[model samples]
Target: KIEEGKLVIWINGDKGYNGLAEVGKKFEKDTGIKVTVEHPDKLEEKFPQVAATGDGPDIIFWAHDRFGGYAQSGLLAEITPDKAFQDKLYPFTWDAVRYNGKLIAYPIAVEALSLIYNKDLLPNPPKTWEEIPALDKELKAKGKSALMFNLQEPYFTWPLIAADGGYAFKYENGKYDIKDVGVDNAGAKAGLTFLVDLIKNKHMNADTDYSIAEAAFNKGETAMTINGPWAWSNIDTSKVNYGVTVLPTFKGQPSKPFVGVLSAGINAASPNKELAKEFLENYLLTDEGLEAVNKDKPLGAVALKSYEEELAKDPRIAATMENAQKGEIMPNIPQMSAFWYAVRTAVINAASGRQTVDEALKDAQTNSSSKAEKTKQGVAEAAGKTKEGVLYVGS
Candidate 1:
């Protein structure tokens, strides 16, 4: 049984859970409820134990990507918010948190890629990817590189692949059919060819990881970097004159970025549901409370429209929110875990000419699908539930 005046919430990520401590203390003192904030290391590792064991956290704060599996496993509670409360968050957040038509999370913020460029370098940003090659010439003459990002990383490359008509998996009837792996297709090859074109033209190189990319942009060595708001801390605004815009088009079609959301979910087995409701739904999720948290740790843009619009008054935040609305919703299913490493290496290998584009991508699809299938089997064996796919506990 839970303590009558007590409730627990667990948070994870850099400065995220810890950032809520002060507000939780205030909530405790004002409401006469004991608000326990727990920040456990390797939360994804420990979460399952907490889910099965009784007297665990009433609320968990993190990205909701694990929601599909957890909700299917009966570890998450179905949330029923009134229209007034529902209206507080963006429509996209609502779509993201639901599984089989049941809401599982209250969204906090969202992140997606956007164009972060040096305003002084170019009076007009290129409107399409093709235009970049030509514009890069002027920047090269000025001894500055054109655009840079972590070329070896797949998360950033997914947009390029998508812009070329590649997709990770096909979604139909509200489910992702791994059988429809789309990365091995012709459009994906076209997107990857662009990356090759960038390197061949001396525009960028694989040596440019995220740190090198962002640092160069901060120092004015490069005109722009494909980055997210999370990298803002790494920039030296005093040394750089930068502005943001939507990622340019490919073949006149808008580049589609993968979107992520951070949210708060409830434990179905928690003994103190009402206390969880009072603190999470009544206080923490409100505009004033959310604003305080953002001050502690600014996450791209808040999910609440009024709060997000107010925060987007900052041009950088506005650019990010714009891309998110038009971008592809990221898939949070367990199989997605198998896709990242295979694709990241494929991009690097293909761009470096170590492997042909078709060879690298076909191998990536084979590697990821096999990895995902194995993981699901493992999860089923341990849980004794073929009912769901397996998760790897080892790091």
Candidate 2:
């Protein structure tokens, strides 16, 4: 159906990370088209520069969040899957790759945060946030922290806010209403108040970060922490015996983490756009292809519903999948860059006693809103122009 001698792809992490590079080898063996996988540093910074010049990989592999900017700048080509193939994947997976209501990538796998706990210390994961006070008191007697995570990071703290009703931006009618920012909403205040109370009550450390909390957990000094599948390898090698489960409910409401989809997309500059599309649709998106990818890295939760039965065999995988089913897809717009910094500032300021929860949230709302407006303006200016101010259409 198409002709191409070779296809180039860029992915973060090591060569063959997440098993896609190895899967590419299978595509080459079957199709006779050579596949080159490159793992370069600063990929997000370098990808757009080269793609804008009509020179870069034929396919780009990354988390879904980065594609919004690429789609906006015409660096990524739109892909329309057949209805049958589209129905094969979970609906939420599409949420990660769609920009302005167009699908720009094929989601390969899904990941979300879950409560990981030391079985020796926690026996079983807590089912409600109210259990934390008694649990903390018991753990402290044994010189262990009941729970810890990146207190100042938005990604880690998101469930805290979402459990009550906080959101970075509003989602309505299948679109993100970026103007209706909710960092300062009542639900957010309630969630942050809970976290603030935890710190003030000495149940959790306000100074904890990813490295610190993960280290403490590995060392068996922390009873529980929140993280995604990527943390499994490290935990597996540690001395602690641990189990993964869904995040506990807060005030009788479910805690929702952000679901991140790892995806593969075609670069618009590639001459073999159609062939690349075929390679993805016919080769990479198949059940066999996903099986191979998961074999390489044990993708905690796959996007294909067909694989659910097999994935459920692993307790850790089942928990992650359940959490992902309940989580919110992270916003994939350029404006999210500002939202991250703003929310982190709010979480840190409030949790560390630097500001009242209300004061911190108000500041975050104002900062993110102003920054989002500027980013939106820049995107509008660059929507259809190339380096030479020529009107260019990607494919």
Candidate 3:
């Protein structure tokens, strides 16, 4: 049984405190597992160090992507929900929580990127990238910018790359293979070329940051921007009626926003693992738990089917769900770290016209592939020799 007092938790502060804090209160009321939520501004910087010393919180709310690192380092607990629990979850949510054949986390919410356009301006958002340039032309003819995105942020380009059938890497047979790193793929190159053309042709603003982009949309100066649901709460929806849609598809396949899951995981080192499990089972994994989450956060629930039905009637939530179906679940492999920095740098360089799209992507792919290869070699060497002269090591 859970104790009547607080259950310490470490959370990322960047996502705001309202939803999580309220959820904590609900958990406490329902299960008597007083959730003492701790907002650590630098959770990525601090949690690992604390966990390394066996002093981490009893529970942690974080992104599913981090499961790879935590699991590989033995910092996370192994949680395997039985058939009944698995049956209760949505398919995609279940997939997100399951990493390397173990349920390392329980998803609370999911988020995906989409195109947000000012309906008062365009009325109809472009359905394809090919339509974007013409839309920009129309905007310019009307003395307004066609679109604005944070060129420096990967969030802007990732969707385009996904739509182009480009991916950072591929996972096969339980191992990640970088042989087909899509940064340099033909479709990716074309997507980058399209963006460059848009900027060069004055169809889009290349220097717009988050604030500028949002302001432009709010003021109806810019017709559209690629952003996520997190922006919905803050965006001025009054003056500028907005519409949301999935990122444009190329060759019938929509751009896949990097999908992420907000999840809770038990601390392996916690002496109260059993109690933690009980609390989670009753208060975080039950129908009541799902209701509490949706009420507090107003985000798409992980596995609760009814939540989807309810949200489908609302335009914003419905669009998010539709986009999520086409989105790519971000790889939870630890090696993914190398791609982020490399891709961001390459894309930024390409966008600024400092390098050709082909050159930039080639460089990113080369660097990432090299790093992944080297990491593989190091792991193989550390594991000694195999029967076929190939070294084998556990991830």
Candidate 4:
């Protein structure tokens, strides 16, 4: 079971390799066990295959989006950090690692979109949607737009759409109610109207996609951009003087972006499951171990609360954590796939004036419900018969 006193972990990217490797030396010295970190291509495609055969790595380091399926398939070992350890992490981070109310992984870092604005253009970002139009008028005179983002992309627009009350699904009692979709609700309509009004009033371009929006912000033609920390690599190259902050409130409600988490989970089939747990919870999750990881390559805002001050030294990370704390985790349940296509079309059509907000979301409601039902059926039918992962009953 010990496999020559070694444990293997597959990381989604190589950034963690050196850091983890360095930290692993301490683990090795203490336990007489070696830790090997790997970054293999097509890991998402291959992990399930090997996991089915009890031959995958002892631990998998990846985004939390896919783990719900893995947990549902009995491929991941449930993790339960002690109360003190749990309290030390950002409470929102746990949303990504749970499946049907059970903890399935350890959250490491977090990623979320925040409001990044040009310091010279706006000393402070708007505090509410009501201020956007006035800001646009001022910026327009200066040959600039008040704000820009991938206009019709649900991921970018979610904060506004859900500001009052919209949601892809009603999450209650620790689960997503797939049947009670919320995309067409009263709150969602109010959100969609705000985006449409911006386009109609010439405050923003209706066709602005991610590339166009980024280009405008990078060139200083837009005073503000709704973006994530990953854009900094390119934004920094452009040398735009910018400040990062949580998005302004909309309709008297806080903006709610989607939070993405990077996590590490034990493999249920690993012979060294106990050792793997020890390494992850005891050594890797410690401050010293995390410091090694951060020094090699900084993580998106770290999920560990104690590390916030050090990471906050970068204002971008600070703003990201602020928005992240106010945001909801992207649903990890498989049924969420159906929500995208329908909502995307609704956003595009509504924003472009091709359909009224009610018309677009009403149709989207019907389309997604039907598609989600089919997904539910397919997963249920495939449960024990096929190697495919199944469900984790949600809201």
By TM-score, the candidates rank as: 3, 2, 1, 4
Q: TM-scores across all candidates?
A: 0.76, 0.79, 0.79, 0.70
How good is model 1 by TM-score? 0.76
- Candidate 4, residues 1-395, lDDT tens digits: the string is 32535898888553456788887788899998888888887676578778877778888887687688788778889886789889888887887788888999999888788998989888888888879999999988988889989975677887888888888877799677778888899988899889999889999877998889989999999999998765666677789998888898987789888777889888887778778778877788777888888766556787887776577788778788789878887887756556767888999998888999999999878876764367898888777455445735444
Give the worst 10-residue stretch by lDDT in candidate 3. 293-302
Model 2 TM-score, all chains together: 0.79
Clashing pairs in 3: 90-303
Q: For residues 25-140, could you state the per-residue lDDT of candidate 3 as single tens digits? A: 88677667667778776575476677776777878877687676777778789886678866766777767777678888777677777788888787778788788888777778
Please give the clash total of every predicted structure, in order: 2, 0, 1, 5
lDDT of 2 by residue, 131-240 (tens): 98889998999888789887856888888788888887787997667778888999889988988999899998788988898899999998999987767777887968
Task: Give candidate 1's total backbone clashes.
Answer: 2
Provide the global lDDT of candidate 1 against the true structure.
Answer: 0.76
Locate the minimum summed-lDDT window of 10 residues in model 4. Answer: 386-395
If both were scored by TM-score, which would come out higher, candidate 1 or candidate 2? Answer: 2
Among the numbered candidates, top TM-score falls to 3
Per-residue lDDT value at 325 in model 2? 72
Model 3: lDDT of residue 297 = 44
lDDT, candidate 4, residue 40?
89
